Amino acid sequence: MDVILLQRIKNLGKLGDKVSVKAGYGRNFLIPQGKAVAATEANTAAFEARRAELEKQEAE
Amino acid sequence: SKVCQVTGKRPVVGNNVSHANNKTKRRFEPNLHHHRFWLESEKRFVRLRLTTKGMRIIDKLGIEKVVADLRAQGQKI
Amino acid sequence: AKLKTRRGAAKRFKATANGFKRKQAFKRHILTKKSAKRIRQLRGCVMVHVSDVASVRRMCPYI
RNA sequence: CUCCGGGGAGGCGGCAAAUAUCCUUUGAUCCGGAGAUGUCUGAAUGGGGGAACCCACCUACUUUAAGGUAGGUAUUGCAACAUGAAUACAUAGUGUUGCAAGGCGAACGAGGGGAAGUGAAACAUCUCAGUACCCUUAGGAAAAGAAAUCAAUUGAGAUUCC
RNA sequence: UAUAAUGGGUCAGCGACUUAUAUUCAGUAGCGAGGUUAACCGUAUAGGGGAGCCGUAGAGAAAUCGAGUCUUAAUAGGGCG
RNA sequence: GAACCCACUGUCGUUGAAAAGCCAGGGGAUGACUUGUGGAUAGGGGUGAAAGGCUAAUCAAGCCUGGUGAUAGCUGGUUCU
RNA sequence: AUAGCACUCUGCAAACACGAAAGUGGACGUAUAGGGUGUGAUGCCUGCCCGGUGCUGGAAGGUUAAUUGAUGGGGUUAGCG
RNA sequence: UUCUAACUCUGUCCCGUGAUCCGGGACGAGGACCGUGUCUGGUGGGUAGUUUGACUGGGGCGGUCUCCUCCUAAAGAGUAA
RNA sequence: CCACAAGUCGAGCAGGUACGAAAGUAGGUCUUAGUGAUCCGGUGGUUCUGUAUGGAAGGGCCAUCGCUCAACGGAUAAAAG
DSSP: OEEEESSOOSSSOSSSOEEEOOHHIIIIIIHHHTSEEEOOHHHHHHHHHTSHHHHHHOOO | OOOOTTTOOOOEEEEEEOTTOOEEEEEEOOOEEEEEEEETTTTEEEEEEEEHHHHHHHHHHOHHHHHHHHHHHTOOO | OOOOOOHHHHTTOEEOSSSEEEEOSSOSSOOSSSOHHHHHHTSSEEEOOHHHHHHHHHHOTTO
């Protein structure tokens, strides 16, 4: 499962990295807890275009 | 009933065929299970009885679209 | 209904001008001990015997 | 029982014939069409029940005693509205109104499941046979139907039936 | 089988080699190196309908050839015509 | 040892009074007892202090309808001159 | 069949049983309890055999099912003669 | 070896609710196990369909089942136990 | 010789051989037992076929291999009480 990170994780990435995670990790932990979102075309475009600066300003 | 909501899969009929070509009736059953999915639009957990192929379809399309499609079909969730 | 052919017999018998031709037996697998004269004389086709022509006619109506 | 049209010497249905009353040329009986009435059970639907039974509620008019009359009160699905938890918004739930469905019946269609006797001169592969049977459901028919189809002299042009 | 082997108490009524399709032989009729239509159309036993089938040539597993053809190195010999 | 519940011996009956009985004797009779009403268990199943016992006069697999006109190298029968 | 005796299983969402599942009995019980099996009041007692089959425990030594897919061989495809 | 987020609870509490079903919410004990789908090896009279030859001085037990030589075989061939 | 399936003896022609000076002899051994049909599959050749075309796969033809199918004309590949 390819997911773009909306938060910093110790090993996965930091603030927007696209990373490949095992299916269950995204299905049951990251997506439901909001720490990452599936790297679909629309989601990636929206994150890169509109809310990148807002996510960065939401530092903590 | 053993019916997948996402895909509609249900048990089907076939044959056990032995080494001497004796045939007997059998059923092939789906890999059906209950699963809770988080829905942010409604802020709740939805429990669905579905298969692993349905899980793959959900991974591909997103929970919102699949739930909307089922509701349009007529399922109450 | 229409008469049906006995396909097993149809695969062993063919029709000639006045009768039926056939192949001969005892030439398939055990051959080392058999003499050369038998090997050569059992080759080729022969004619169906008159006594058995009637059964072949019954089993193969359309040939 | 009422009305419209036909008809013109009789008639009051049959087993089942009789007397008696009786109706009829101001037109009967009878024939065709349209209306009125239509108890109880039965999907039965106000609740119950051993079918043709027992019991109950609400509204409105009459009533004076312990009644009558006219209606309404089932479930499920959908829609509108109102109300409304754990829980703060919500949501679940709850309720009113409006609409629709249930059941029965000959064969034919479509779909889900699906034998055995028998034959093979025994019998297990095979046959019987997707037959018998069970279940779901539509119409006057159903289904199929307009090529990611056939053919191969480089041609034919959606389905269906003989 | 007189049999002491089977069946029948008696009478009246009923009671068992059929029908459809395909094929083969015989008789009979039409036509004749030719014979014949099927579904179907048709105010319909008529008329139309020639797609198709049987016959008119065999040999060879087959390619192929053909009053010839198969076998063979062989115009020999032999099998089927 | 009566009622009530059983069925050890013998006679009679065997087209019976009776498709399981009568008569003379016999056993239990405060118990693991007898019995009324209403319920539950359904056929390769049920129940069984156990006999393959009982499951509507039917049980080594109940009854009814359907497959069905099952199959039978067997037995019987098969009509005028 | 019985009171008594003995073997074995079951730590509770128990073992076991019914059912296609849901679930139900065991039991609104908890090893002094529940299921299976054999013997059969009581008295004296109940000898030898673990070679065979079963059960229980251990060993990791030989054999491999799905799965995975090294290497090899073959058909066709390019260019050269 | 730890963890919790899938997942289990025939554990406590709150609500739908007047309810030892069920659903949702909180907690607690477990937890990537158990369990289920597909595939695959082993076990499998628990259940199901079947089979288990003929001759023969009845059947069973015993013997035999194919081929060669002599006699029975009656001076051609053939000829049974 | 023979119900069939099968079995047996053989003059003679063409080719290539061995032994003889030569006429000539030799198509297993003095003869009569030493055996197994069909289906399926393996191997060597093949001027046959090759599902649009060229190939290939597969099929056919000649030679040959795998049954104590001994209940030996051989029910199925596989069967006791």
